Design a protein around this ligand. Structure first.
Ligand SMILES: [Rb+]
Ligand SMILES: [Rb+]
Ligand SMILES: [Rb+]
Ligand SMILES: [Rb+]
Ligand SMILES: [Rb+]
Ligand SMILES: [Rb+]
Ligand SMILES: [Rb+]
Ligand SMILES: [Rb+]
Lengths: 489, 489, 489, 489
């Protein structure tokens, strides 16, 4: 009811989907129907693919610096529209407006800006072989890539995916999460408004098992970039391979550990833990959900942790004093509660939370209290499985080598962090943790220069950093022979 | 048979597989049984994995310069044993002895030598963020990788895969093709003799559908490197994704084009055409099986090709005077012969060859004469599909933009080549070809410095060159915060 | 004087110089006094050096993306004032308004734009040594750099020198040529309006023997970048080295060769030659002043050269129809005419020009007719020495290996060019030429990505390209030891 | 003397110097004349340069892997003859035999081993411009470069200079120190024996004042690498530049600071201090001659240092237990004795040594006892200036930022080191120290992977690391124009 019927975006104009069916998107703070959104058919994906192939031809035909200037124009618009877009992100995801105004559009435009200035620097190699022959390589675009986004950081994930694709000369077909489609459509307007060729950034909406699947199966799409669940990511990746042998980037979940060593400043460690567990209402791909505290500091540490949680300002995501909103949708809230119920059932001593917040207007919303369990064993479900909700698990260890072994005893490897004041230990311990994103005495910072990605089953490939731009290009090796040819026939 | 029963290689020695199964490997030139080879069981795969996990711990713990010395010592051994192994490769694949003595072991040891000197150079980045924080990356080994090799260049493929894998600090479990398992076991002997830690290169032999599959499903293996056909490569990758989300390198087949431009010296163009079609008896993934001649030179070019083909010395691969051996096996010959029937049947003009050679002692072997088809259209099966046998398809074009457009009208993209004398055309045309390996006035050369891999459905990832060594490491980003930690809680 | 009396630029403002002396800058088109320019004192050098140290500390303190934005605003400002700044560049140099509106500020700002997006890309190395120790490198700013500019491309040289200097986090003290000081002062205004901290770009004006000398001898300045004559550059470098061991970059002169091979299209060969000899009225270091034509084509080539010269529109640099201005000054004119007189004296067959244009209103200016000599020997003065004027020398060669040999036979190595239609010849020939900037079938184009500098006595170090930005930082190696320290004492 | 007349090594042979003069080299341990050494005349430098011109052409004409193998065999020869050369190094330098078998030849072949394996990794860039034009760079040898070595590490310095020089494809003319010429001549044999082309590594011996000067002035030499004192390095750099505008690498002196922070293990801080002052009898450019100890720890630290100094087993370098030899010559000894006598005069509280050892057989040698001064102010001569001897200066500081400010306050900047167990302190402190080699909780280890060189007046350029290999090539930029040429005339 709140917004006009959202249509598909193909070729710089809005288009009509050829399906006749729609789905709704819902405000989690109250339950509003935000908009009826059209779902794409197999015919609409085929249209976006054809629109992207021809649009990419124009984008790639430009100079490195033209694309650089156009993308930089898109940065300028994103900054001028920060407040407008940040509010729209809060309507759809339920994230505090204090967070979306400073983080989502801010750091999403940050990465677009970083690559925008690196486009002219994309280069190939040159190797001499002998007086008569040398090889040189080219870095050409892949062509049409497609990105599938998650719902916790809709606008940023779109930028973190599309920024390097466009910097490298590709067109991207973006499918926003079925939960949060509004914001990605506004980014398509902005890319077109900045001068990006028609077709280079199309947006397809609809159910994940259908339109997302069809994008991954398509014979002309050259790469799939996916953010989401590890379990879903496997089904996605196997499909992208078996269909046409596409290159893939996977940013999946993780049960990331945070080790607090004895010489750590406990006040800093408690600030770290709560930031790593309860920011965005605990709905971050890289949250440090397994906090390893040394037995000797266990009691003092929970004292500091409960003190922070109790002053967490939960409330309406539209209110500026709110730093803790609802969960993304009523279905997801229920599973987070199921895990919370599972932690109680296996006798993991609750400390706070464990309730759905219902008093006053919070019954109209999908509110879950900041929840911390303690005295957890390694075999409990809340220690083994990714909850993707505001649930901190405090584990107790005895030796340094035990905490590193346990941090590693997970099928996940997205993030890890140590907190310590010793030079030797900080570096020695971070080297032993099997994770791609490692923090020392901090948590949650991802600058655009720093490649971020998962070990093991938390991901394949990387995002951000220099390395990521390279993986949106293909190496072509050209050997130039200047001398005579030796045939054995 | 000709050799003792080849056992499994795990932990620095030969071991007995516990499976109870064996298989024969056959010389295609005469039909003699070369050896009985043991097949790995699921327990043996587990044993090799446990050996690699442990052996990799030792290897990564050495200093980069010690590993470099160890790999270089193996190079000296490979040069010491060139003629021995080349002979072994000729019994196992049937390739002429003039080829295996100069190509298979030489260029395999060429690549190992290259990476042997690059180990001390593997480095990570360091990025300043602010006076109070910096990030640095580590290039950690993936751990235990697995390689699955093809049968056309057994020892060469094993070397191109194990060299960067071992140079990066990994342990690799190698599965040679069930067709040609002998040479890879000698490679395990050589690495151990040079000082490689026990377990860093184990070799399991056996079926692709069982032991090869069990490897790609294994949870403790971190990457799969595969060489073979595209239809098989899709299933292999889908298995590695769906199982544990492994990293992959795919070296698949292709129907690579060779465009001969009107200004080409047709004598060089004809030597290039045959070298790209009949070396290794047409069993090279990167063979340029679609030859583009301009109509004005078609007649004279066919003359030049036909004159050269008639000289080809088909005969016993044990004779050093033979330059054209049998195919790898009789089943494969039936398939290559099946395609020839399609070219005769689809009204394509057979120019020479086109039959199986049975004259004299050649009936005991899998011999197909070099076959040239001409007046081929794009709708014919022999133009659209990888034959992997000595079959040349000569296509006629009228202008440049047709020939480049047609060369690209394929789902394959492994190699391509132009033959021309004009500076502007050579560079302009080769830029427009959709292939990862481009040759100008030459063919089939892959220097170790030059990354090689396929576009489109011809591959994922690269081999050789600096970039490949990078893709046997994973990036870990460590952000060190030295200043204060902020918190919204 | 046309303009108000020009002061020094130190600390974000114009200040009064403590010398008591001034000098005039003169319009070469008519003889008009453009401005009185202040001469810098020793106290003024000491004053600007203290300001650059204070400014660099502020500048290095910003985040890389802050520096990137500031520089990008200066790029946008420079695009807005292109025609205005181009007008000022034409009064000061006498170069046509058709050139300065197209080349001078355009390609100077191009380099600033290139480097502006690369600041977040400056990174250091990280090398693990063993589990117990690792090394990382930093790319720290050099500190306070100093630039001494030439007068042929006043505003462009300032940008090409200051763009990498500031992008790397350094402060620069720039001394423009005493002949062309006007534009350097406007750029200091532009950097300040764009947000550059006070002191990061100061401007000192005056004679090289005084102010330029004091800058190269000052102990707190860490690097000197000088563009100018080879004879002068040697004294500058010896002075900067002997004084405090500053690192240096030299862009010096050249007698650059242009080899036309027999199979070249002479129409392009003649178009290249005139552009390489008469652009900017012949006053470019990278001019092709030795043109090698094959004996067979000499007659045809001179004809094509004469035909092109005869349509050169010499005239008032303020006329847009003018594409060939006067020389930069009357003293320099006597020099260019002295060389012409020496070549007439040495029996070179003057083909056209060779005298000063004095007809009508051209008498007020230092106009020299485009001069081409032919039938030249290698020992003549016009062939051996750098003229820096509109004088083309046509030498006749007989085969390829001789022309490469003669072209290399010089103490210079700045630029060289071949013109040919053959793939093999172009690359083989350009590989044997001892010059740092090599063009094939073109001339005089310098993209920002391409490192440009001289071999031999034509220069030290490079400008533009990635490599230059690296050489405006100094490497610091930090080894962190995490284990025990062993001592033999 | 003990050995026959040592001659010049030019063009693969020992040759007769055309000078008629000779000079002697003396064992500092006893005073025996080791050899009569010939001085090169001006005519011999021309012979060695012309030999190097021809020798390099053969060397650069080889493939990267051929050159790599030749250098790699030379490493092997050096490894076998390590203990032989270590014996020769002790006669000439007087350095303990416990040092020369472990450090001098080991770490010299270490760097040669590093670069020998990096030759195929030398690559250039390729940058596209438009469909019709691209730029590529080549990294070509400089040609004939020349090295001047210091006398403290004769074999090590010769290797660290020639290893990257040859790996890049250059020929070197090396002039050993007039003090220590012996080992440099045996290195020339070893290169030739490994297969180095004749002339690629020549050795001229003789006066610091004459032959070294004649090399830096020679017009066909393209680079000078000098290791030695800053006073001479300034004259060296000035002369090589003013003559023919050569590039230089300078490894000059330093008064390197060692900051011991309050939270440090004093025992490790003392092990570092003595090693950083007394290895090689204190004659290393990177010696930590300014030790900064905090006021509170001064007493305990002085004790731990003196406890260690008192057990230094000084003695005859031909002994296996001698770990402290004489100084390199009787002239150098008196200079070191001179600095001590002045430090006594400036009222610095001597702690130990302070005298020349003459008791018993040590009177025949140039033995100087390990000397430590304490309670030092910055005014003193022993604190500002390069002693190059076993003289440790202990400065007392009060708070952290002051010690950083004082340690930085020198015209030198080769090395610096902090000893602390705090993450933030260690890294923040090392970031503000202005030296090219920074050590944390260690000292004096210099791997081949880590570029080493000085800030400020301690050097120009780097040695070791990849970057050093890069700076023995010159970049040539090649722009290929495939489209039309646009001429404005
Ligand atoms: Rb929603
Ligand atoms: Rb993975
Ligand atoms: Rb076989
Ligand atoms: Rb692919
Ligand atoms: Rb002027
Ligand atoms: Rb030079
Ligand atoms: Rb000596
Ligand atoms: Rb310096």
């Amino acid at each position: 009811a709140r917004f006009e019927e959202q249509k598909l975006y193909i070729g710089g104009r809005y288009v009509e989907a050829s399906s006749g069916a729609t789905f709704e998107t819902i405000n989690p703070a109250n339950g509003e129907v935000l908009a009826k959104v059209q779902r794409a058919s197999r015919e609409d994906v085929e249209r976006a693919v054809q629109s992207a192939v021809e649009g990419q031809k124009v984008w790639a035909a430009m100079t490195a610096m033209q694309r650089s200037r156009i993308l930089r124009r898109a940065v300028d618009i994103l900054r001028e529209r920060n407040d407008e877009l940040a509010a729209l992100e809060t309507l759809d995801t339920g994230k505090p407006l204090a967070e979306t105004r400073s983080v989502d559009i801010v750091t999403g435009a940050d990465v677009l800006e970083y690559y925008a200035g690196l486009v002219p620097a994309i280069e190939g190699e040159q190797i001499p072989l002998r007086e008569t022959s040398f090889v040189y390589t080219r870095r050409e675009p892949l062509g049409v890539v497609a990105g599938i986004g998650a719902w916790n950081y809709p606008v940023q994930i779109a930028l973190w995916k599309s920024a390097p694709a466009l910097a490298a000369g590709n067109a991207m077909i973006f499918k926003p999460s079925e939960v949060t489609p509004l914001t990605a459509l506004k980014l398509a307007e902005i890319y077109t408004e900045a001068g990006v060729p028609d077709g280079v950034f199309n947006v397809l909406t609809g159910s994940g098992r259908e339109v997302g699947q069809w994008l991954t199966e398509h014979p002309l799409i050259e790469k799939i970039s996916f953010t989401g669940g590890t379990s879903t990511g496997k089904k996605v990746m196997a499909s992208a391979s078996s269909s046409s042998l596409k290159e893939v980037t996977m940013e999946l979940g993780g049960k990331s550990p945070l080790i607090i060593f004895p010489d750590a400043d406990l006040d800093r460690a408690a600030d770290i833990a709560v930031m790593a567990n309860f920011f965005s209402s605990g709905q971050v791909c890289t949250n440090g959900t397994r906090v390893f505290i040394h037995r000797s500091q266990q009691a003092r540490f929970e004292a500091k942790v409960l003190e922070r949680v109790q002053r967490i300002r939960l409330g309406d995501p539209q209110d500026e004093n709110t730093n803790f909103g609802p969960l993304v949708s009523f279905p997801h809230m229920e599973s987070v509660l199921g895990y919370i119920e599972s932690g109680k059932a296996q006798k993991a001593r609750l400390l706070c939370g464990g309730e759905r917040v219902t008093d006053g207007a919070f019954g109209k919303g999908a509110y879950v209290a900041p929840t911390v369990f303690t005295d957890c064993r390694d075999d409990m479900t809340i220690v083994r499985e990714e909850i993707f909700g505001p649930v901190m698990s405090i584990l107790v260890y005895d030796d340094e080598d035990e905490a590193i072994r346990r941090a590693n005893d997970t099928e996940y490897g997205l993030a890890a962090g140590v907190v310590t004041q010793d030079l030797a230990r900080a570096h020695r311990a971070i080297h032993r943790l099997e994770a791609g994103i490692c923090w020392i005495n901090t948590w949650g910072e991802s600058p655009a220069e720093m490649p971020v990605g998962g070990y093991k089953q938390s991901g394949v490939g990387r995002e951000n950093g220099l390395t990521t731009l390279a993986h949106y290009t293909r190496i072509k090796s050209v050997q130039v022979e200047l001398g005579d040819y030796a045939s054995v026939f």
